[PDB]
C-alpha cells in the first residue's frame, strides 16, 4: 500500500501554506521547488512530499481544503 | 553448394570450423602418418584419476594430442596445469558429495612431448607451451580441409 504518513502530510500542508504561489500541478517542478525550501536527509521523503503537495494543489483548485489556510 | 565459399570469402582458419571435426581429422592424420610418439602407458592408464574406467576409444591418445594442439592454439603459453582444467571432470566419490578434479598432468605432459617431437609445439619464452610456425600452419591448413569436407 501507498499511504502518506503524518510526517509527509504535515510537511506537505506546511509547504503549500507558505509557497502556494510557487507551486504547480506538475510533480517535477514542485519537486525542484521543495528541494531548496525544505531540509531533510531522506530523498524519498522529499519525493513523497512533492507527490502529496501536488495532490493538495489539485484539491485546492476544486475548492477549499481542510487543514490548509491561505490568508 | 554445401561447401561453396559463402561469398567474397576464401580460405579458413582455426575457430572457423567445428572443434570436434578438426580434432577428429587431426587425430586421423597423426595415426595415418605414423610419426607421432605414442607411449605404451596409454594402453593401460586412465586419462585422469577422476575417471573410473579407461578410455574406450583405442585412438584416444591421438584425439587427446589433437585436442591439446587446438588448446595450445587458443591459449598460447599454457602449461600442463592449464590443460588439466580443460580435461577435468566430476569424480564420483560414492556416498559422499562429488567434486571437480583436474585431469592428470601426466598424459598431458606426454601429449605436449609428442607434439614437440613433431615440431608443432615448442616451449614458449618465459614458461608455458606455444605453437611453432609449422604448428600454426598445420592447424589452419587442416581447418580448410574440414571446411572443404576432405577429412583425410
Amino acid at each position: 500500500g501507498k499511504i502518506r504518513t503524518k510526517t509527509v502530510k504535515r510537511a506537505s500542508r506546511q509547504v503549500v501554506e507558505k509557497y502556494y504561489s510557487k507551486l504547480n500541478f506538475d510533480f517535477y517542478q514542485n519537486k525542484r521547488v521543495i528541494m531548496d525550501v525544505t531540509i531533510a536527509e531522506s530523498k524519498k521523503l522529499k519525493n513523497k512530499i512533492a507527490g502529496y503537495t501536488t495532490h493538495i494543489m489539485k484539491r485546492l483548485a476544486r475548492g477549499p481544503v481542510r487543514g490548509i489556510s491561505l490568508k | 553448394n554445401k561447401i561453396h565459399r559463402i561469398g567474397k570469402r576464401k580460405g579458413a582458419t582455426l575457430k572457423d570450423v567445428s572443434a570436434w571435426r578438426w580434432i577428429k581429422t587431426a587425430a586421423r592424420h597423426f595415426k595415418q602418418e605414423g610419426k607421432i610418439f605414442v607411449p605404451n602407458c596409454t594402453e593401460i592408464m586412465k586419462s585422469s584419476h577422476g575417471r573410473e574406467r579407461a578410455p574406450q576409444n583405442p585412438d584416444w591418445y591421438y584425439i587427446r594430442c589433437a585436442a591439446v594442439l587446438r588448446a595450445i592454439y587458443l591459449r598460447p603459453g599454457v602449461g600442463y596445469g592449464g590443460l588439466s582444467k580443460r580435461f577435468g571432470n566430476k569424480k564420483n566419490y560414492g556416498s559422499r558429495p562429488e567434486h571437480t578434479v583436474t585431469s592428470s598432468t601426466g598424459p598431458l605432459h606426454w601429449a605436449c612431448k609428442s607434439l614437440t617431437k613433431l615440431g608443432l609445439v615448442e616451449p614458449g619464452a618465459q614458461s608455458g607451451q606455444r605453437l611453432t610456425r609449422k604448428g600454426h600452419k598445420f592447424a589452419d591448413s587442416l581447418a580448410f580441409q574440414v571446411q572443404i569436407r576432405k577429412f583425410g
Binding site: - | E43, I44, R53, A54
Partner: protein
C-alpha cells in the same frame, strides 16, 4: 555388430569354475569371475587379442584358455605389478593376482592370520564388527 549368431553360441560360458553369461560383452562378462574387475577385464581382452565389441557366447575354446591363462598369471603377459590385487603377500612376499575361488580362500586365511595373533583388527572380525574405524 550385425554378425549372425553362430551355431556354437553359448548363453552360459564356463570359465575358472564361474558361470559367465554369454549375452554380455566380453569385458563385462569376464568381470563375473571373482578377482576380475572392469579395469582388469579390458586389459585381459587387450592382452588376449580379443575385440571388446564381441559377445562372450561367441568365444572359442582356445580363446577361453588364453583368457584363463592370462587371469591366472597376469605378470607373464606384461601386466604391471601395481595393477594386481595382491602385490606383496604378507606370508610369501610374492606378487600375484587372486582369481575365482582363491579370492575367498585367501580372505579366509587373512582373517585367520589376524585372529591367531589376536590383533585388534582380527578380534573385530571375529566379533562381527566394523574394522575400518566406523
Amino acid at each position: 555388430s550385425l554378425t549372425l549368431i553362430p551355431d556354437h553360441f553359448q548363453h552360459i560360458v564356463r570359465l575358472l569354475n564361474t558361470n559367465v553369461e554369454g549375452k554380455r560383452k566380453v569385458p563385462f562378462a569376464l568381470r563375473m569371475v571373482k578377482g576380475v574387475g572392469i579395469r582388469f577385464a579390458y586389459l585381459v581382452c587387450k592382452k588376449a587379442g580379443i575385440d571388446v565389441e564381441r559377445r562372450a557366447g561367441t568365444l572359442t575354446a582356445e580363446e577361453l584358455e588364453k583368457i584363463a591363462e592370462i587371469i591366472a598369471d597376469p605378470a607373464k603377459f606384461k601386466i604391471p605389478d601395481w595393477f594386481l590385487n595382491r602385490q606383496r603377500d604378507p606370508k610369501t612376499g610374492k606378487t600375484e593376482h587372486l582369481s575365482s575361488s582363491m579370492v575367498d580362500t585367501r580372505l579366509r586365511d587373512d582373517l585367520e592370520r589376524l585372529k591367531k595373533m589376536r590383533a585388534h583388527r582380527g578380534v573385530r572380525h571375529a566379533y562381527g564388527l566394523r574394522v575400518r574405524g566406523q
